[PDB]
Amino acid sequence: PAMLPISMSDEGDSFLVKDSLGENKIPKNPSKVVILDLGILDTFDALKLNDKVVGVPAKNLPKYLQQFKNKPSVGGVQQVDFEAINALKPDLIIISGRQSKFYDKLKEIAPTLFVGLDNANFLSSFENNVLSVAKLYGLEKEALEKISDIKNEIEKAKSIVDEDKKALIILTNSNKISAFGPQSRFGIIHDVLGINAVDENIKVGTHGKSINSEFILEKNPDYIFVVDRNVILGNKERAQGILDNALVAKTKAAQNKKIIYLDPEYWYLASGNGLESLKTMILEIKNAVK
Numbered sequence: 001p002a003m004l005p006i007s008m009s010d011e012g013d014s015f016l017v018k019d020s021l022g023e024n025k026i027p028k029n030p031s032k033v034v035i036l037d038l039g040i041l042d043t044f045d046a047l048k049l050n051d052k053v054v055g056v057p058a059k060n061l062p063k064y065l066q067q068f069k070n071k072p073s074v075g076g077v078q079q080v081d082f083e084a085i086n087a088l089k090p091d092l093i094i095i096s097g098r099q100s101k102f103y104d105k106l107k108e109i110a111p112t113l114f115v116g117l118d119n120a121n122f123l124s125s126f127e128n129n130v131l132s133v134a135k136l137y138g139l140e141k142e143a144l145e146k147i148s149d150i151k152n153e154i155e156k157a158k159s160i161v162d163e164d165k166k167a168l169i170i171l172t173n174s175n176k177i178s179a180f181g182p183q184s185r186f187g188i189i190h191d192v193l194g195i196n197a198v199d200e201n202i203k204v205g206t207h208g209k210s211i212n213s214e215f216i217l218e219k220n221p222d223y224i225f226v227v228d229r230n231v232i233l234g235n236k237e238r239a240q241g242i243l244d245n246a247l248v249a250k251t252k253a254a255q256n257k258k259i260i261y262l263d264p265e266y267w268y269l270a271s272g273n274g275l276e277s278l279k280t281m282i283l284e285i286k287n288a289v290k
């Protein structure tokens with residue numbers, strides 16, 4: 001079933017808000033927001049809300065968000081510094097799926113809004129997250145224009161896609177490989193941009209289905225989209241070395257130089273959950289397959 005969305009009613013100087021984790025009273029125009037979703041951080045920047053941001057997970061701050069490098073840190077996306085959050089005295093904390101498990105602890109500190117994406121309904125959830133944040137600040141007009149521009153980009157990207165080619169999405173960690181299909185955390189490649197999948201039913205898991213290079217060759221993708229989690233975790237291994245092997249070399253993707261190394265900060269950290277990231281990621285795909 002679809003994830004429950006964020007819903008809100010206007011309460012004068014505040015909103016009454018419900019999402020899939022719970023209910024909150026959120027002040028209008030919140031002044032001190034701790035943001036633990038990197039995509040939503042980029043939406044705050046797109047909406048010119050940088051001064052509302054009181055703290056960010058500096059351990060995982062992407063290259064494309066370095067304008068937030070002066071903000072107080074609240075740790076990393078997987079290493080949340082609850083003391084730092086408390087010390088910032090936020091009026092609102094914004095989380096996604098990585099921090100759901102700490103919901104009760106965060107809500108003790110301040111109202112806690114969940115903005116995770118629904119992998120089965122990416123665009124609907126994406127719009128709900130953007131427009132909910134925009135509603136808090138009265139920025140619906142600006143947000144809607146930016147969403148309309150993204151939808152136009154989606155159409156332009158779709159128009160260049162080759163109906164007869166198929167792709168596989170993989171993730172590398174350590175010297176290991178895992179795979180992702182349609183309606184996964186990386187599913188927009190298939191679900192929104194219409195690139196065909198080599199396998200419609202790849203076993204779901206947060207960090208993917210363990211596979212070997214024999215599987216890659218068996219599926220013989222035209223494109224391989226690679227997300228190197230090693231870069232995010234600080235491990236020394238790299239995808240370019242893992243995939244330089246005799247099995248992968250026999251794929252159409254290798255033979256046509258269509259092993260595409262996706263920017264892991266966008267794909268794995270932001271997850272396309274921002275006005276900036278999603279636009280940039282659509283272009284990244286388009287330019288890789290045109």
Ligand SMILES: O=C(NCCCCCCCCNC(=O)c1cccc(O)c1O)c1cccc(O)c1O
Binds near residue numbers: 078098099206
């Ligand atoms: O809830 C999540 N992960 C919890 C994992 C807890 C146990 C393993 C922790 C050590 C391994 N993970 C990392 O060291 C890591 C570091 C930065 C960002 C990540 O996403 C990471 O998994 C999670 C949710 C959505 C997307 C993700 O991807 C996640 O993980």
Ligand SMILES: [Fe+3]
Binds near residue numbers: 207
């Ligand atoms: Fe993770």
